[PDB]
Amino acid sequence: KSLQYLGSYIARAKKLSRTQIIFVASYLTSWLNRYVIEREEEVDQRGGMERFKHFYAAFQALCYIFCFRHNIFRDTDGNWECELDKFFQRMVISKFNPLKFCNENVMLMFARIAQQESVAYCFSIIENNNNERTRQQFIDLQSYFPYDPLFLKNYKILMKEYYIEWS
Amino acid sequence: PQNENARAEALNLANTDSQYLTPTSGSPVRGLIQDHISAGVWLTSKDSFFTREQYQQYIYGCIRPEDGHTTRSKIVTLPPTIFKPYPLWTGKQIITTVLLNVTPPDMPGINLISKNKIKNEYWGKGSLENEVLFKDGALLCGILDKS
Amino acid sequence: MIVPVRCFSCGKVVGDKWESYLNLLQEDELDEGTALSRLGLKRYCCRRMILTHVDLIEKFLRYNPLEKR
Amino acid sequence: EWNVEKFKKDFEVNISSLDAREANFDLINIDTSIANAFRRIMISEVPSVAAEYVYFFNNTSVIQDEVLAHRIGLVPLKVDPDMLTWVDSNLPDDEKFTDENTIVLSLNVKCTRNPDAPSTDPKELYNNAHVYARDLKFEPQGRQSTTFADCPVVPADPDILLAKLRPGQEISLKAHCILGIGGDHAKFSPVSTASYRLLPQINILQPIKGESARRFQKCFPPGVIGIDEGSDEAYVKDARKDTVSREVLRYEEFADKVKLGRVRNHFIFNVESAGAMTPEEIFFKSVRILKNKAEYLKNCPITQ
Amino acid sequence: DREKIKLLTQATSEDGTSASFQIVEEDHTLGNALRYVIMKNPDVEFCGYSIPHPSENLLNIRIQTYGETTAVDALQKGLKDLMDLCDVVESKFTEKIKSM
Amino acid sequence: NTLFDDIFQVSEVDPGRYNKVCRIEAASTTQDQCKLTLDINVELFPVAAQDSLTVTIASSLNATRSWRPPQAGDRSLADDYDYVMYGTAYKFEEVSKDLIAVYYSFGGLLMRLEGNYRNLNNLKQENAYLLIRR
Numbered sequence: 001k002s003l004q005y006l007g008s009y010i011a012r013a014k015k016l017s018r019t020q021i022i023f024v025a026s027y028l029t030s031w032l033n034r035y036v037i038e039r040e041e042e043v044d045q046r047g048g049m050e051r052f053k054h055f056y057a058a059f060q061a062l063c064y065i066f067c068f069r070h071n072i073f074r075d076t077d078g079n080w081e082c083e084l085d086k087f088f089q090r091m092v093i094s095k096f097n098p099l100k101f102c103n104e105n106v107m108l109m110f111a112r113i114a115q116q117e118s119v120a121y122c123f124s125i126i127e128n129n130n131n132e133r134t135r136q137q138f139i140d141l142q143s144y145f146p147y148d149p150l151f152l153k154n155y156k157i158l159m160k161e162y163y164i165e166w167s
Numbered sequence: 168p169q170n171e172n173a174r175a176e177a178l179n180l181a182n183t184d185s186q187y188l189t190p191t192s193g194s195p196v197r198g199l200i201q202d203h204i205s206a207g208v209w210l211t212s213k214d215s216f217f218t219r220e221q222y223q224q225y226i227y228g229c230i231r232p233e234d235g236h237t238t239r240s241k242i243v244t245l246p247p248t249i250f251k252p253y254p255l256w257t258g259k260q261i262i263t264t265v266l267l268n269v270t271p272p273d274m275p276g277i278n279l280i281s282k283n284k285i286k287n288e289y290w291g292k293g294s295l296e297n298e299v300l301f302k303d304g305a306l307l308c309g310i311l312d313k314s
Numbered sequence: 315m316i317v318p319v320r321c322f323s324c325g326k327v328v329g330d331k332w333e334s335y336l337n338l339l340q341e342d343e344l345d346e347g348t349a350l351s352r353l354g355l356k357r358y359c360c361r362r363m364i365l366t367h368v369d370l371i372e373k374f375l376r377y378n379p380l381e382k383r
Numbered sequence: 384e385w386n387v388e389k390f391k392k393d394f395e396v397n398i399s400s401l402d403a404r405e406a407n408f409d410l411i412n413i414d415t416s417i418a419n420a421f422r423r424i425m426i427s428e429v430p431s432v433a434a435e436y437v438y439f440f441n442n443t444s445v446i447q448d449e450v451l452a453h454r455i456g457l458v459p460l461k462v463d464p465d466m467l468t469w470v471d472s473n474l475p476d477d478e479k480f481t482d483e484n485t486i487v488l489s490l491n492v493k494c495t496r497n498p499d500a501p502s503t504d505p506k507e508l509y510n511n512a513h514v515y516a517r518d519l520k521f522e523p524q525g526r527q528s529t530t531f532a533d534c535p536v537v538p539a540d541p542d543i544l545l546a547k548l549r550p551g552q553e554i555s556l557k558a559h560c561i562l563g564i565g566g567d568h569a570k571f572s573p574v575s576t577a578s579y580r581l582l583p584q585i586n587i588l589q590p591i592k593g594e595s596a597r598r599f600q601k602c603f604p605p606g607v608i609g610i611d612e613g614s615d616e617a618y619v620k621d622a623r624k625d626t627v628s629r630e631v632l633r634y635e636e637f638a639d640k641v642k643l644g645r646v647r648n649h650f651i652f653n654v655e656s657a658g659a660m661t662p663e664e665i666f667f668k669s670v671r672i673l674k675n676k677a678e679y680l681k682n683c684p685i686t687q
Numbered sequence: 688d689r690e691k692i693k694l695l696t697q698a699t700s701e702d703g704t705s706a707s708f709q710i711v712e713e714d715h716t717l718g719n720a721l722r723y724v725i726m727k728n729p730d731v732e733f734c735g736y737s738i739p740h741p742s743e744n745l746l747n748i749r750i751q752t753y754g755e756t757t758a759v760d761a762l763q764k765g766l767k768d769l770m771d772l773c774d775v776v777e778s779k780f781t782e783k784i785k786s787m
Numbered sequence: 788n789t790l791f792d793d794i795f796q797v798s799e800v801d802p803g804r805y806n807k808v809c810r811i812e813a814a815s816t817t818q819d820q821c822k823l824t825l826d827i828n829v830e831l832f833p834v835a836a837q838d839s840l841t842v843t844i845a846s847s848l849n850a851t852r853s854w855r856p857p858q859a860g861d862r863s864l865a866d867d868y869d870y871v872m873y874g875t876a877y878k879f880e881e882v883s884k885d886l887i888a889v890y891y892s893f894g895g896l897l898m899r900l901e902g903n904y905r906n907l908n909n910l911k912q913e914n915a916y917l918l919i920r921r
């Protein structure tokens with residue numbers, strides 16, 4: 001939850017030092033390098049997949065920034081931010097399948113922008129998901145996102161200030 | 168137990184694993200002694216011969232690997248005894264593979280030599296099946312009974 | 315007491331035979347067996363339900379508080 | 384290799400003696416595995432219709448209103464299913480018992496004293512003395528009145544001794560009717576008995592001609608053992624005209640001259656009901672939902 | 688209605704050669720009928736049924752198979768043939784009931 | 788490959804008051820001391836007094852994992868032969884000199900093999916197929 005407090009604390013606002021958002025949270029992108037160097041020699045040992053609640057959420061929370069701010073995810077020159085052609089490409093067919101145990105709403109917004117902006121390729125994997133695919137109430141903590149859209153009509157007086165619509 | 172520290176000990180000291188051999192003489196009092204053992208006579212003897220469909224159903228009603236009783240990847244069985252347009256099986260073969268599909272590997276089978284209460288003069292003449300023997304843990308001769 | 319509708323294990327409703335049985339032993343001058351066996355009784359777990367039945371409403375229909383005596 | 388037309392010419396059907404009550408039924412070339420999936424879906428997983436909810440008003444008799452309550456629901460109802468759909472279970476009874484759900488039934492008998500001259504017989508002594516099944520009557524509530532114009536939903540056997548009365552007492556009740564499978568109650572078994580019997584395979588080994596021919600036939604049922612002459616060896620002539628009673632094994636000389644086994648691929652059935660259903664009706668109720676048992680299973684999205 | 692098929696993955700492999708299938712509320716009406724046709728599939732090396740508790744209605748079956756045949760695909764052709772195991776006692780049988 | 792090869796003679800038959808099993812004694816037709824003991828299964832192979840057996844104990848059939856069910860057009864060395872057994876060897880013994888007798892079973896199915904010429908090719912085995920003729 002604490003790194004899920006980084007999901008809509010970055011996305012749905014307007015006043016952010018966005019040169020620092022990649023910079024201060026670079027340790028979480030350095031986590032994604034640390035998670036693949038030192039911590040992919042342990043899966044065939046005693047245990048299942050759910051040791052790593054840190055992995056289906058903070059990677060999801062940075063991909064919760066993905067579908068909302070695509071004009072931030074491009075620079076002036078023409079390349080990708082931190083070489084998106086390899087960074088979100090190396091984590092496909094590993095020992096966790098991060099396109100297998102996912103969310104419904106935001107983790108199936110992964111279908112529009114991944115093809116038309118040429119981000120990733122997962123369209124021949126969605127059919128392959130639902131063949132192989134406590135813990136029964138483990139979904140209760142991994143379904144709620146903290147800073148959801150606002151429903152009231154007279155506190156929106158204060159908070160339509162730094163809150164933008166879908167684009 | 169209305170605490171938790173008595174869940175520690177009553178799962179681990181009053182448990183049925185640790186009261187097999189009773190400390191009164193060393194004569195054990197635990198086991199199926201009424202119906203599953205007079206039906207042990209009519210299972211493993213040679214007057215109870217089994218087909219593939221009997222041998223297959225009679226272990227999956229025992230193991231139930233969804234609860235977890237396999238140890239290598241899954242369940243396996245033995246080759247059939249008789250090779251013929253129907254492979255027969257044996258009740259001696261029945262007790263073996265259930266005694267095989269639960270023990271983890273890196274572990275040799277067990278070897279018993281013991282007796283029964285059947286006294287082969289009631290199996291006719293000259294056929295010796297009062298005597299049990301577990302080569303690699305398999306009822307390789309004799310009919311299991313009370314003893 | 316009262317005839318059990320749809321006998322214990324058989325599944326046949328052996329009650330229409332009961333008054334029909336009582337008409338046999340009364341005036342028709344029939345036996346106990348083939349009188350009972352001339353009724354559509356294929357099995358023998360039906361056969362007791364009229365061979366045995368005691369008809370003991372009679373000691374409950376002779377104590378009536380809803381009429382005098 | 385398995386092939387279905389390597390079972391089509393295998394699977395053989397004969398029909399021995401069919402009525403609307405009993406159907407002797409030579410269903411041949413099938414396994415004892417399938418001698419339950421057509422035996423059990425005849426007996427308890429087949430849609431039957433009987434009364435369940437008994438809205439009493441008054442029960443004045445000496446017969447106490449527990450035991451009589453599950454007898455007016457227990458009665459065989461001469462009513463055809465697929466005229467009445469399934470019933471919702473846990474909503475309140477307003478949208479639970481519509482006209483589509485309930486065959487609204489009612490019973491009302493008020494007996495009295497009749498003066499008469501005299502072992503004085505009770506029907507000869509009282510009006511309305513012995514309430515039977517034919518006093519139970521039908522009255523619709525809702526949006527059907529024409530679907531039972533062709534058949535009023537009569538109780539299947541009108542002679543059922545529901546209660547016997549004495550003057551002063553009376554009875555007036557109103558039970559409600561519903562579907563149901565026999566796994567719930569035995570009242571929802573639309574067959575009395577659907578048990579099976581294999582074909583007995585009697586064996587001979589020697590000719591029994593001579594004086595055993597008048598001894599191989601006394602103890603057996605007479606229409607089984609066809610003695611032919613003193614010669615032309617006596618073939619046992621009728622197989623299924625015989626139970627497996629093996630009384631010949633009590634003899635000490637027909638212990639090896641003759642054997643007996645069973646053909647495990649040759650079945651006779653005996654399906655009979657209380658009148659509500661017929662054996663000429665229910666084969667497309669044990670099959671046609673077992674047919675719909677299987678195809679529902681295949682097209683279901685696999686989970687977890 | 689996703690209470691019927693349930694891949695109980697706590698007895699499976701990676702590529703799913705075998706799997707303990709979880710289906711609810713049935714009884715011998717499948718296990719003593721689908722096992723009779725699962726062995727008719729020639730790429731079947733083990734199968735059988737089981738009861739999780741005899742009082743309440745619940746089942747659990749498991750199949751085994753050789754290569755180029757998964758777990759759930761051997762349940763396909765098993766239940767494609769129960770669709771025809773009762774069809775023969777309709778298609779051919781409608782003749783014999785017609786002309787008794 | 789074959790490890791044992793001869794022709795035997797059924798001496799006497801007794802039921803044991805079993806159902807599908809009768810005990811068979813088997814001397815040989817080529818060496819007057821080899822006395823095989825046979826608990827035959829009677830229904831796949833009807834035995835009688837003084838039949839003409841051919842009791843051959845090979846080991847294998849030309850990785851070989853386990854019992855595949857017998858598929859169409861295979862190559863078994865036991866294709867030509869019918870009552871094919873499978874078992875292990877568990878106990879040797881000793882009789883008079885230059886004779887080495889074994890005990891041998893097939894799921895509670897006793898053998899006893901007096902003889903000599905099996906002391907150079909046979910031993911306490913695990914996988915042997917009994918390729919019987921007739």
Ligand SMILES: [Zn+2]
Pocket residue numbers: 321324356357358359360361
């Ligand atoms: Zn009966």
